Amino acid sequence: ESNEVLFGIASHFALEGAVTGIEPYGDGHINTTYLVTTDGPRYILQQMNTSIFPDTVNLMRNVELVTSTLKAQGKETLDIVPTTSGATWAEIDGGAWRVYKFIEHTVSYNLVPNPDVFREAGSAFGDFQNFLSEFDASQLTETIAHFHDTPHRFEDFKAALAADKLGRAAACQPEIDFYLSHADQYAVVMDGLRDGSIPLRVTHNDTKLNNILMDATTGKARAIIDLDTIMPGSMLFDFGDSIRFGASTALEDEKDLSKVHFSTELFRAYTEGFVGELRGSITAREAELLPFSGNLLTMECGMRFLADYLEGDIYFATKYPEHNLVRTRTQIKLVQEMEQKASETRAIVADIMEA
Ligand SMILES: Nc1ncnc2c1ncn2[C@@H]1O[C@H](COP(=O)(O)OP(=O)(O)O)[C@@H](O)[C@H]1O
Ligand SMILES: CC(=O)N[C@H]1[C@@H](OP(=O)(O)O)O[C@H](CO)[C@@H](O)[C@@H]1O
Numbered sequence: 001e002s003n004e005v006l007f008g009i010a011s012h013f014a015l016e017g018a019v020t021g022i023e024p025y026g027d028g029h030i031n032t033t034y035l036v037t038t039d040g041p042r043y044i045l046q047q048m049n050t051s052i053f054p055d056t057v058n059l060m061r062n063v064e065l066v067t068s069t070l071k072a073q074g075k076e077t078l079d080i081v082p083t084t085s086g087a088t089w090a091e092i093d094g095g096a097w098r099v100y101k102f103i104e105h106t107v108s109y110n111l112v113p114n115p116d117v118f119r120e121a122g123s124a125f126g127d128f129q130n131f132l133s134e135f136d137a138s139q140l141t142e143t144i145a146h147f148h149d150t151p152h153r154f155e156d157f158k159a160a161l162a163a164d165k166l167g168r169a170a171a172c173q174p175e176i177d178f179y180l181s182h183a184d185q186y187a188v189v190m191d192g193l194r195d196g197s198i199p200l201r202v203t204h205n206d207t208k209l210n211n212i213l214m215d216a217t218t219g220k221a222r223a224i225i226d227l228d229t230i231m232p233g234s235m236l237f238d239f240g241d242s243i244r245f246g247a248s249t250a251l252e253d254e255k256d257l258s259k260v261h262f263s264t265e266l267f268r269a270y271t272e273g274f275v276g277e278l279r280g281s282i283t284a285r286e287a288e289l290l291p292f293s294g295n296l297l298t299m300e301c302g303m304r305f306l307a308d309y310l311e312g313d314i315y316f317a318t319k320y321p322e323h324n325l326v327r328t329r330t331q332i333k334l335v336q337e338m339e340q341k342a343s344e345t346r347a348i349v350a351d352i353m354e355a
């Protein structure tokens, strides 16, 4: 957007300084995020993606509930900056906008630099699961239906495949056939939720590493951010998605596949932190499925990238024509290694569960 428009958006909100700049910020794929610099404090300005989140009112009700509950326990969270009229967000010229205080003195990662960071991530998201269990499902309505319903995601993929809108399928048969051939594996968690053998828990559902901010001095988790997909699910969704993004030795969109590997050391680090917090609640069946949840969420995210590629990149932000194809290829590479290292990851979980 133009500065004129963005500065105009900013004037709707109860900011506490003269705005000097509003610049695109971050590696989030969904909302459109800006850093607001002023003569004092910083802010994050976001245009919410209403094609993905059509029910802005319900989305903001969830964010308000989660954040206000954290605040009421003296816990740092996202601080909504209200409109100058006291609302939690603003509809302006057909767009939905919100502002958060910029969370200061923090660092974040798109790639794990060492095991300690990822262990801390595990601890933080494990703790967040405990926090979220204080809510019952009825308080947090789904912001996106079938969000980690992998069989449903596969129906979406198959439809995108069959339509082949852009004729992109011809260049990615190996990737397509990978997802088609794994179709038998996609229902394991949904089946478990449906018949009661996996508990339905309130979950974050987007636990990739760059949705948590760590303190720049202590290295401890300061705040879990990107609260848009908090809703009922399985613990396995949060665990698996974290492993997907953070147990890789490479970026999500790394072009050079030789750099992309699944790290059992990073798997162990995260699991130690995560299970460490949830040992009192984790069931036998959840523990059994922890390794495979890595596979599952990586395949789900990968199929979604490839579906988006086949549909002309309508869902995820992209920087170049092949971006989603590049992303799907890292996810496949990771799953190939997770399959190969299945016995090691089983052993790692078994080991951590006793200790
Ligand atoms: N309150 C905040 N303080 C500092 N940084 C933030 C804040 N909120 C978001 N960010 C940064 O902006 C990025 C994108 O925001 P996010 O809510 O994750 O958007 P998306 O939904 O598009 O992923 C985050 O990954 C993080 O780096
Ligand atoms: C609401 C939504 O679709 N979020 C996506 C999206 O997360 P963001 O933090 O919003 O960029 O990109 C992820 C892949 O990087 C994917 O796993 C996730 O489900």
Ligand SMILES: [Mg+2]
Binding pocket: 028, 029, 210, 211, 226
């Ligand atoms: Mg995000």
